């Protein structure tokens, strides 16, 4: 279908085809040499240059080499600098360049490539949608929003644009506004809309506004393979890990960690209160839009498996105690942190991002009335000096209606069924 050959390339099609046959037969090293010779003999040939880039791309997959891929990324750009490049080939080459820049984490680089694509192909809506994803991947939600607004003003029923616009509105706490965009977008069935992120956030926006249709979307998201269940809606999962909302210490196997937290809970409490009293700005406000109302702040000692040295200056004995327990200090998908929540707080039903951790809570200052936590269908309370353990990839919800503050210590552990290999290899969250 695509027209990749300019006038001159059509005259050398036999040599170009021979080289591409070598790549398709998996003879990647012979194919790079064949296209390198064609680039030498025919330095202005766009098809020869694209073949070299594609072979380098395949070679980077074979060798699993970022450096080889950076070479391919440069050659794809070279294609676009040559004279007379057919439009289909220019679009293929820069699109793959951007895609590979993203694979490498070169998000600013990918963004420049996508901006260039939109300038070169000003009527191609899918390229603007791709540029919007570029902005979202670098956290620039304001520019992503402007991009999807432009797309929607030309093509108002583009479902990819609607679900991404809906995602942005929801992230900005424009909850009611986000619902029709997320809903219509998923309903379009357009490519790219069948995505657990959009089911997750449509259901959640619905819950926040009191729309009882929420769980029908969770059910559909489960049927479509996006969620382990309607209750457990995390999106960064390892399939097959034991799934239950509440755990006992013995079920986790981390009984030595739990005994240490419970034997030594007063030191952990006292260091948290000293920060409250003398260094309270180390407690940072919860910043993931999880509160309906109230005040909730957290003081983090470890995140992504990395000790915060300045924070541990503020709780040195607690950090010394916890460093004996790599099941939590090396949990690169969880945190170790103090949490303070005050009366008048309600935390929306929500889900953490991953089924790869379990969340321990050690009670430190627990008012006798008014504090409770629901996980899935079961609500519990805390006790001073005692650990509760739940899987926060299940929907959970908290109310603080006491007459004084609540302080807990949160300790994430690797899910116990994860092998050491997985604990080494899983990307941090």
């Amino acid at each position: 279908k695509p027209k990749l050959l300019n006038k001159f390339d059509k005259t050398i099609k036999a040599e170009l085809d021979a080289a591409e046959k070598l790549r398709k037969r998996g003879k990647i090293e012979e194919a790079v040499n064949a296209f390198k010779e064609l680039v030498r003999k025919y330095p202005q040939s766009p098809r020869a240059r694209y073949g070299k880039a594609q072979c380098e791309d395949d070679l980077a997959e074979k060798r699993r080499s970022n450096e080889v891929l950076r070479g391919a990324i440069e050659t794809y750009q070279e294609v676009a600098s040559l004279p007379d490049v057919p439009a289909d080939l220019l679009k293929l080459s820069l699109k793959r360049r951007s895609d590979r820049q993203q694979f490498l984490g070169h998000m600013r680089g990918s963004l420049l490539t996508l901006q260039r694509l939109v300038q070169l192909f000003p009527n191609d809506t899918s390229l603007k949608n791709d540029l919007g994803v570029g902005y979202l991947l670098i956290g620039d939600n304001d520019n992503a929003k402007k991009v999807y607004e432009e797309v929607l003003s030309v093509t108002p029923n583009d479902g990819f644009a609607k679900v991404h616009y809906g995602f942005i509105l929801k992230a900005q706490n424009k909850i009611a506004e986000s619902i029709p965009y997320l809903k219509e977008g998923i309903e379009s069935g357009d490519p790219g809309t069948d995505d657990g992120r959009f089911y997750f956030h449509l259901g959640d926006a619905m819950q926040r506004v009191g729309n009882k249709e929420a769980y029908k979307w969770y059910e559909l998201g489960h049927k479509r393979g996006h969620f382990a269940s309607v209750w457990q809606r995390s999106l960064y999962n390892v399939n097959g890990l034991k799934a239950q909302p509440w755990w006992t210490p013995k079920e986790t196997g981390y009984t030595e960690l739990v005994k240490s937290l419970e034997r030594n809970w007063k030191l952990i409490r006292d260091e948290g209160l000293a920060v409250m009293d003398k260094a309270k700005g180390l407690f940072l406000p919860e910043d993931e839009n999880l509160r309906e109302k109230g005040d909730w702040s957290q003081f983090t000692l470890w995140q992504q498996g990395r000790r915060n040295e300045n924070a541990c200056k503020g709780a040195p004995k607690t950090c010394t105690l916890l460093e004996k327990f790599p099941e939590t200090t090396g949990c690169r998908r969880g945190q170790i942190k103090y949490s303070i929540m005050h009366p008048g707080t309600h935390v929306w039903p929500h889900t953490g991002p991953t089924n790869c951790r379990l969340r321990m809570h050690l009670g430190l200052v627990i008012p006798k009335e008014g504090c409770k936590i629901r996980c899935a269908n079961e609500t519990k309370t805390w006790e001073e000096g005692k650990v509760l353990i739940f899987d926060d990839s299940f929907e959970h919800e908290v109310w603080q209606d006491a007459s004084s503050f609540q302080l807990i210590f949160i300790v994430d552990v690797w899910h116990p069924e994860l092998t050491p290999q997985q604990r080494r290899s899983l990307p941090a969250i």
């Binding site: 998000m107 997750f200 839009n289 990307p427």
Partner: peptide
């Protein structure tokens, strides 16, 4: 922006190639 307690970011992991 990291996904610490929730799932609010467009992606929660970092991209580092192979």
């Amino acid at each position: 922006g990291k996904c610490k307690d929730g799932l609010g970011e467009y992606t929660c992991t970092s991209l580092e190639g192979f």
